Amino acid sequence: ALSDADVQKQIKHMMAFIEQEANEKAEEIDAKAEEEFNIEKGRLVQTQRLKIMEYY
Amino acid sequence: ELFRSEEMTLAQLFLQSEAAYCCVSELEELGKVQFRDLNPDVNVFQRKFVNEVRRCEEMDRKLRFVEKEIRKANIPIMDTGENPEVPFPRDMIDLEANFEKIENELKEINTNQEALKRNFLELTELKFILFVAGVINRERIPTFERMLWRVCRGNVFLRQAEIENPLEDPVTGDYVHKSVFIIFFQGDQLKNRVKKICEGFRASLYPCPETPQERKEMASGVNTRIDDLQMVLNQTEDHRQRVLQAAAKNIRVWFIKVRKMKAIYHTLNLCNIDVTQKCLIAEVWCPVTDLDSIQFALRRGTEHSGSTVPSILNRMQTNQTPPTYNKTNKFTHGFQNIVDAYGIGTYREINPAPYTVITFPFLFAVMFGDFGHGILMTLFAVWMVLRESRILSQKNENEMFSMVFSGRYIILLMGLFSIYTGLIYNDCFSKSLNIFGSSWSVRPMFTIGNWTEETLLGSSVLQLNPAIPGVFGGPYPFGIDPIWNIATNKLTFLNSFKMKMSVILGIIHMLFGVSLSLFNHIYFKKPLNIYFGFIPEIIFMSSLFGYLVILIFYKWTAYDAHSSRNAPSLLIHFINMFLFSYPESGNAMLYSGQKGIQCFLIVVAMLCVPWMLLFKPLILRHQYLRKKFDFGDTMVHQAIHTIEYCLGCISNTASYLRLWALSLAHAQLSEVLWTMVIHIGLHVRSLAGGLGLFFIFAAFATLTVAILLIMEGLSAFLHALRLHWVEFQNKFYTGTGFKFLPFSFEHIRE
């Protein structure tokens, strides 16, 4: 009672499902990358900034 | 237009996991689709329902434990509610554990209660206490005392103590007055000795009595603690009772909830797990008829779920042999089952059941054509139907009653037709039904026909009533004239009818069964099965066996008593027909030109054999070489069909002599069982006759049921069914299929 086009629509739906997850996952990955970036940077700058000051 | 199996369609359904829980739930309750296991090498662990099944099993064991305790408590749990809710939330997992905690509490209650009982069982003894006398069940105080005497006889004084209106003994839970003769010693070696002796005996030596009132004060204190204990027991029991009633209310709901969730989990394991998507796709076969119903069901299921996945059934063309689905109802289901008992029909095979509904009761009624017993049989079926609601809504552990109940609508017809045939047979416990229409002969005219004072010689003779005396004749309006039920030669008149009738009916049913095959061969577009099969097959059977039937009717209307001497013999002409035996004399012919007809029909029947024997394999071989086919094997298959068909036709026609054999036997048992049992209950003495008939009748009714209503009905039941299985169905109802087992909410009565 329902066409092959609506099955196709369901396929398109699951594709949309996939794209949404794809987007969420990439965003999660980039956000953690930025967090690791900032964490390592802060550690390094604090370490050396302190040593320079101490020397002076 | 014949009834056939329903169409189902195999599809691949792709359901998102969350949606999948909802969909399986809804579709399982809807019940019109069947899933296949796509990964037979994969276990439940592999399907990932192992946690689901183990959880269900734990809940099940807990439920069964509680249920048992509930039954022990005689709680009136109904389990008649909750049927349509089918919850399937994930939260149930934790709630089931909470159910277990409830049950765990009862064990603890029982644990404390028994412990409490033992102290109670013990403490009562102190009240009876308030030399150390014991308390015994008094069953063996005779030997208790004598055996203690002999430890050192007469060494210490006997202490006599008795308890009236006692409590139940803790070991036996039995209340019984105590009458105990005790030996108590001051010496340590002997006290130790008697301790050993009295303890070996079933005796309780719990207290150590003392003269000082301090011990009495102690007992008073214990008595107080004992009353407190009783009050605690009363509290523990009240909680126990409250919790158990609460469990009966929850447990009726949970039985279903858990049973259903588990079933859902089973199906979920009954799936193929995809890799690219967290979605399961399955091959599911569902009736085309229900295709809209299922699509709407998919919509409802997935609509409840938040993911709103389309949940589309993906229709596909699968060679995979579909299951055989026959829609039945409360009446026809039983008839379908007696067919299925022999086998599942080929997909789109002609269903014999729509015709069995009448055909089988009819053939039974022929075997069991007994007016009186048909009533008894009908009333039994009526009882079961009138109690149908009460029989369903109860437990029926007796499989014998369940069987006849399941067939109760089959039996109903069996009785109704048995009444019809019994009336025509005009036999109700060997008694005919005289409607004052019996005009077979006019006895007054018998005397006119040169029989003057024949009753003088009659004192030693019977004398057979002549045919065509000019004063006798005329058929009975309905059934056999009652006069034959009192004849000494009924054993030829009536037996002749049943033999000839059995042949007539059997052959007609055989011809019908063959006719049905034409519709099936046309449906499957097998021209060869009708051009080389049906046509020569139906001619074969008609030319030999239908001819016989015609001649039987012919004689009945062609020859009268005027030609009874040297009257044609139907069996002899039939045999001589096949053998082309045409003697000049010794047998009268039925009609002029019969010889030519007899020869013609046999030749044609033999000429029919090549058609069915060799034309199909030969033409198929031709088509192979023309189009460009296992020719040898095809010849084997067709030859077997031809050989079995022709030889079976001969045997099958004779087989229907079952109708005669069973009908004859029943009539003979009825006549003798009547004559040698109930007749004996009658006597010329008035009161003695009545009192005797009372007891004799009861025995008569007993034998009629034990021998005829049950056993002969039972044998005729099977034999009529066999006729369908062997001779009728094998003409058209061929091949095998699979039983259709869709998702269904079967466990409703449980």
Curated annotation (Swiss-Prot), chain A:
Positions carrying N-acetylalanine: A1
Localization in the cell: Apical cell membrane; Cytoplasmic vesicle, Secretory vesicle, Synaptic vesicle membrane; Cytoplasmic vesicle, Clathrin-coated vesicle membrane
The keyword Ion transport appears for this protein: yes
Keywords: Acetylation, Cell membrane, Cytoplasmic vesicle, Hydrogen ion transport, Ion transport, Membrane, Phosphoprotein, Synapse, Transport
UniProt function note: Subunit of the V1 complex of vacuolar(H+)-ATPase (V-ATPase), a multisubunit enzyme composed of a peripheral complex (V1) that hydrolyzes ATP and a membrane integral complex (V0) that translocates protons. V-ATPase is responsible for acidifying and maintaining the pH of intracellular compartments and in some cell types, is targeted to the plasma membrane, where it is responsible for acidifying the extracellular environment.
Family membership: Belongs to the V-ATPase E subunit family.
Name assigned to this protein: V-type proton ATPase subunit E 1
Coverage span on the entire protein: 2 to 57 of 226
From Swiss-Prot, chain B:
All ranges on the Cytoplasmic side of the membrane: 1-349, 388-402, 517-534, 728-750
GO molecular-function terms, A-Z: ATPase binding; proton-transporting ATPase activity, rotational mechanism
Compartmental location: Cytoplasmic vesicle, Clathrin-coated vesicle membrane; Cytoplasmic vesicle, Secretory vesicle, Synaptic vesicle membrane; Melanosome
Gene Ontology cellular-component annotations: clathrin-coated vesicle membrane; cytoplasm; melanosome; membrane; perinuclear region of cytoplasm; plasma membrane; synaptic vesicle membrane; terminal bouton
Main localization of the protein described in the UniProt heading: membrane
Transmembrane annotation, as ranges: 350-368, 371-387, 403-432, 497-516, 535-555, 601-620, 643-667, 689-727
Coiled-coil boundaries: none
Keywords of the record: Cytoplasmic vesicle, Hydrogen ion transport, Ion transport, Membrane, Phosphoprotein, Synapse, Transmembrane, Transmembrane helix, Transport
Residues found modified as Phosphotyrosine: Y325
Residue intervals annotated with topology Vacuolar: 369-370, 433-496, 556-600, 668-688
Modification Phosphothreonine, positions: T211, T321
Assembly and interaction partners: V-ATPase is a heteromultimeric enzyme made up of two complexes: the ATP-hydrolytic V1 complex and the proton translocation V0 complex. The V1 complex consists of three catalytic AB heterodimers that form a heterohexamer, three peripheral stalks each consisting of EG heterodimers, one central rotor including subunits D and F, and the regulatory subunits C and H. The proton translocation complex V0 consists of the proton transport subunit a, a ring of proteolipid subunits c9c'', rotary subunit d, subunits e and f, and the accessory subunits ATP6AP1/Ac45 and ATP6AP2/PRR. Interacts with SPAAR.
Task of the protein: Subunit of the V0 complex of vacuolar(H+)-ATPase (V-ATPase), a multisubunit enzyme composed of a peripheral complex (V1) that hydrolyzes ATP and a membrane integral complex (V0) that translocates protons. V-ATPase is responsible for the acidification of various organelles, such as lysosomes, endosomes, the trans-Golgi network, and secretory granules, including synaptic vesicles. In certain cell types, can be exported to the plasma membrane, where it is involved in the acidification of the extracellular environment. Required for assembly and activity of the vacuolar ATPase.
Protein name as annotated: V-type proton ATPase 116 kDa subunit a 1
Native species: Rattus norvegicus
